[PDB]
Write a structure and sequence with these properties.
Subcellular location (chains A, B, C, D, E, F): Cell membrane; Cell junction, Gap junction
Number of strands of chain A: 3
CATH class of chain A: Mainly Alpha
GO molecular function, one term (chains A, B, C, D, E, F): gap junction channel activity
CATH topology of chain A: de novo design (two linked rop proteins)
Largest interface: B-C, 33 and 29 residues
GO biological process, one term (chains A, B, C, D, E, F): cell-cell signaling
CATH superfamily of chain A: Gap junction channel protein cysteine-rich domain
Radius of gyration of chain A: 23 Å
CATH architecture of chain A: Up-down Bundle
Distance between the termini of chain A: 45 Å
Strand content of chain A: 5-15%
Helix content of chain A: over 70%
Shape of chain A: elongated
Keywords (chains A, B, C, D, E, F): Cell junction, Cell membrane, Gap junction, Membrane, Transmembrane, Transmembrane helix
Subunit structure (chains A, B, C, D, E, F): A connexon is composed of a hexamer of connexins.
Oligomer: homohexamer
Bound molecules: Lauryl Maltose Neopentyl Glycol, calcium ion
């Protein structure tokens, strides 16, 4: 029915501010739609866009494995589903809380939902921060046009060339920014609930 | 229910004129359906449609990266999701405004929605205008049939040929026009709310 | 709810005859399903089905660009979305008209919807007629099996062969017919509303 | 609502027998699901499965165009949408008939729906019969393993070989049978309404 | 509505036992999801995975046509839609039975549904049994790694090799088992309704 | 309706703890979304990523069949549908239990649902445990970069190289972990219902 959904949305947004009510959900949906629409077009053909000037058998696969042990498309999919796990638990915890109290009325129980909201914001802050650092550690801010490889079974130094480095750099920097703003407004929502004075006392 | 949706549509369209109520939404949906249906068919195979008459390793990827640092398909996807961000915030701000005032009645509060409507039109005017200028700056109005390239690792001047320049020019000019009409009627909707006299006083 | 939809359909079909109530919508849906299901199978591989007997670099792309500056698949997609634009505006204009008059009652206002219905039929007649003429001007009624090309950078006269001309001719003639019947019954619906005597007086 | 749909189904099935109420709709859905699931797998790669033992330019496309001017996949799509056109008109004619008589009560009008039901069965009998004859005239009952071709620009007699003739013959015979049973039970439904005595008097 | 569906499910499951109420529907859905998800990955590229060591034109297509006149993917699609035909007729026969008796009350009629339930179980037993025997007759229990071919236009004995025989054998045996359990519990549901004593008297 | 679903969720979650109410469903959905989104990208092209340095006909297919008799993508699809079978039976058993007791009231019957919940957790523990052991037995924890093959029709020892071993090892270890946590919290949910004292007495 429609009177149950108006209670599910009003209870899940009673403690938050407009930063968590509107801005964060739109930022997280913006990131997902962008990855789904444009991601495969930029990084989907990474293996065929990696050309090494050699003929020894097995050398091209050894050099590509050293350059990228994990593709950005796999990294970003894992990020978006991990960050969604704390929110799925909180929405489920709110769903059953409304079902069971409907059946007795048509603070002590309303306060346990506040601790649940503070806890999933804290988990998201730690997950968003560790993902940004891992992203910088793996890929950096720029994708090169060449790559020098020295490994077995290659004999000597092998030079390999990449395709579309400018477009890949642009998409990389765009995702660092969208993720950086998600972290900032997750921290700001905690400050406005009173984290400034909690850490003091 | 159906009586809640009749209030959500009536409140979200109380301040607008027929230009913003009917014409703008149909223009923006028209642009999205056109890009989804025809876009990949015209620009999807840009890399394979770029033939350079050379044999040096790495030269074809260097010349294509100089010609297009960003494909039109990626540019237009970013435009349509950015312009949707101000409208998603306004529709969410209206959704919660209706939920909370249902629960007390079955100007001062109706006026804050007017400032929200004026503000997302202003943000869309700035986003639509900057996108048109960037589009003209990157691609122009015409797609050539040839391209001269002088860069490393290419030795000398390399001539490259493109496929389907007429069909690409037609689709480019069509999108500049659909976007140009979106900007005009976003400006006209502000004038009819009283922007002519606001800037005066 | 279900009592709102019974009013939306009854008001949007009060002035029309059975030609506009049943026959035109089925004809327009028939055209869309046919293009979606069979279109890509007949015209999707046009570029690979165009073989020119030459070896000069750049000549095959120059001759194909002269033969088809616009593919039929792109032309027909643009036709079906343009013709839908007048109907989307009329259905939206009817939606809000029902929402606002529900809220005061649970001719002068019913007559403005008649002018809106006459106006979108007139716009569709002009759009359907101009599209048929453009179709005949671009493609004709028959797709050839060969094509002579004389353009730069080709040296001399180049002969190119096409694949599946019979199946392409059949699909072309079928779409001219389905579109021709859409035009006829759009004109007949205006005559039955009284266009015969309007143009007289 | 759910009380409107119970009236839409009861009125659309008041005059029919169990042959038209259950058996015909299941037979027509069975044919559509079979074509969608298995059709592209059997006939989708017809062009690449047609090998001619020659080297003259243009000869392979001339011989394939003579063998199949229309693919079975295109023929069967056109059949299923044509046969659906009489049923879409009848269901629409019943929808508006229920909407307008709801609004006056919460034989002469019930009898006009009988003529509409008899008329769409008659149109389906003519469309189903003409399609079966056209199918036999175009393809037959068997798909060969070889094909002799004598046409320009081929010099002499050219022999071409086909792939998977057994699987194509099986799918062809299966569709003739499913369509043949659709025709039989469309004729039987007319006989049970009284066509035996109508043609007499 | 929701009170109509609670009657549609209660009437369609009044005569059955837990074997037909829960176990059979889950077994049949399990088979469909498995075929849709994994089937194309194992058998989709059968033609390209069939390598014959020859050069005569037309010999490879003649040998593959002898080995498989019907692919397992086409056989299993036909099985799952045939077995669904008796259940679609019974669910439709129950739908109209509930619609018409709602309209007179808000054994003799409840008993005709028992004969309908016994009859579709009997039809499914015959269809499931004939499909298992046909499957064993066509494919067996094992897919070989080689194949000897002696047919026109091949000159002599031709040896052909197959790819992935172990994975194909595993998927074949799995489907024989899932289908074998469907047959067993269709027979057991008839025994529990009283088939043991019916065949006696 | 919405009052029926609030009873279906309240009855299906009356006996469980928060471990089974929230955590297990989110873990199992997390695994499915990850396999659907990223799985084909990592393992989809396994056959083309397997290069053997030979020329004898039939040797490459013999060595690949020995290395992988079953792909991980097929193994993981079978795991997720098997583990879902006990939950589908329990949800169906709860659905009919609510339908039939609605129709008599608007412990002995509530206790039979407890045995059903304990039984599907036990079946899932056995299925999850046997799948983990089979996974370790088939693939291990690491995917190599090379493979030595000695089988007919290969003459001698053949060395084959694999592509992307690092990314495949990462995805393999990730799925062992997600499945290992599913097993742990299925065992913990039984302990909290009283399995510690049941096995004692
Ligand atoms: C109304 C006034 C408006 C004024 C606008 C000022 C703004 C300037 C825009 C700057 C920008 C916007 C990209 C769009 C991003 C949108 C974000 C959304 C993304 C979607 C999710 C494109 O702008 C450039 O476009 C060029 C087009 O070729 C122009 O070329 C000239 O003019 C043309 C004119 O027609 C002529 O035709 C053309 O012949 C001329 O040569 C340049 O003049 C112009 O600066 C990005 O600049 C890019 O520059 C390249 C250079 O190297 C960078 O490459 C880096 O170095 C490589 C070599 O070491 C490495 O190999 C590579 O690894 C690395 O990348 C890129 O990294 C990036 O920085
Ligand atoms: C009832 C009376 C109706 C009267 C109609 C008058 C209207 C005229 C229409 C004009 C238009 C409509 C395109 C449809 C757009 C729809 C928009 C929706 C888009 C979907 C989202 C096609 O019209 C042309 O079609 C030609 C077909 O080949 C005709 O060819 C002749 O007649 C045939 C007859 O059969 C014969 O067969 C055929 O052999 C004859 O040669 C021309 O006569 C005709 O003008 C576009 O014109 C195009 O011309 C080309 C020329 O160069 C332009 O190329 C440019 O220059 C290149 C070389 O430098 C560059 O390389 C290229 O980069 C650049 O592009 C294009 O840019 C574009 O301007
Ligand atoms: C129960 C009695 C029923 C009597 C039926 C009478 C009706 C006749 C039907 C006519 C029709 C229906 C197509 C279906 C359209 C459905 C529309 C829905 C479309 C789906 C959206 C096919 O009918 C033809 O089919 C042939 C099959 O090959 C038959 O071949 C013979 O018999 C076989 C017998 O088995 C033998 O096997 C076979 O060996 C025999 O050779 C012909 O006899 C028969 O006329 C179309 O005819 C076509 O003819 C070709 C000839 O050229 C036309 O080609 C044109 O010229 C080319 C060369 O210049 C150009 O290159 C090309 O550009 C151009 O096209 C086509 O344009 C088109 O006109
Ligand atoms: C429990 C007892 C059950 C008794 C069952 C009796 C029923 C017999 C079934 C008959 C049927 C069912 C197809 C399934 C249809 C399902 C419909 C649903 C479709 C899905 C929508 C397959 O049955 C055949 O299968 C063969 C497999 O190869 C068997 O081969 C042997 O035994 C194996 C044993 O293991 C050995 O392994 C194997 O080595 C042995 O050689 C045959 O013995 C058997 O008759 C179809 O028969 C087919 O035969 C071929 C012959 O030519 C026909 O080819 C035609 O001629 C060509 C050459 O001129 C042309 O080129 C071609 O154009 C044309 O086609 C086909 O047209 C078709 O008639
Ligand atoms: C915790 C204790 C748990 C104990 C577990 C005991 C259970 C044993 C499992 C048995 C099974 C499970 C398949 C999963 C089925 C899941 C069903 C769901 C399907 C999804 C819908 C795989 O198990 C095998 O896997 C091998 C992996 O290569 C192992 O190889 C060794 O150990 C590795 C260790 O690491 C080393 O690495 C590796 O180097 C070692 O060589 C074997 O030891 C092991 O038996 C299937 O066995 C298979 O064997 C092959 C042999 O031929 C059969 O091939 C047949 O003959 C061919 C040649 O004539 C034909 O050409 C072919 O046509 C035909 O097929 C197959 O038919 C099938 O029978
Ligand atoms: C803010 C501080 C944060 C500190 C972070 C510390 C954490 C360290 C992370 C470790 C990790 C995270 C992978 C992400 C997993 C996410 C899980 C979700 C999955 C999605 C579902 C990547 O981390 C490595 O990335 C390298 C990038 O190349 C770096 O390279 C250097 O630095 C660069 C710097 O720029 C330079 O550019 C670059 O030139 C430098 O060379 C390394 O320094 C770094 O350790 C995985 O490590 C991997 O190492 C390889 C080595 O062999 C392992 O290969 C194994 O051996 C092969 C040869 O025998 C076998 O062939 C192969 O079979 C086997 O695999 C892998 O197995 C795996 O263990
Ligand atoms: Ca680029
Ligand atoms: Ca063109
Ligand atoms: Ca043809
Ligand atoms: Ca075959
Ligand atoms: Ca295998
Ligand atoms: Ca890797």
């Amino acid at each position: 029915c429609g009177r149950f959904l108006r209670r599910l949305l009003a209870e899940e947004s009673r403690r938050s501010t407009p930063v968590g009510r509107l801005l964060l959900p739109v930022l997280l949906g913006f990131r997902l739609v962008l990855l789904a629409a444009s991601g495969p077009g930029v990084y989907g053909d990474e293996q065929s866009e990696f050309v090494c000037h050699t003929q020894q058998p097995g050398c091209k696969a050894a050099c590509f494995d050293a350059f990228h042990p994990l593709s950005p498309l796999r990294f970003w999919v894992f990020q978006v589903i991990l960050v969604a796990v704390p929110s799925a638990l909180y929405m489920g915890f709110t769903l059953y809380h409304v079902i069971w109290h409907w059946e007795l009325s048509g603070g002590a129980g309303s306060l346990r939902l506040l601790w649940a909201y503070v806890a999933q914001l804290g988990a998201r802050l730690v997950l968003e921060g560790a993902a940004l650092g891992l992203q910088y550690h793996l890929y950096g801010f720029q994708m090169p046009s060449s790559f020098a490889c020295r490994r077995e079974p290659c004999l000597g130094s092998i030079t390999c060339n990449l395709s579309r480095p400018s477009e890949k750099t642009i998409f990389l920097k765009t995702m660092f920014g969208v993720s950086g703003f998600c972290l900032l407004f997750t921290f700001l929502e905690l400050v406005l609930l009173g984290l400034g004075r909690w850490w003091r006392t």
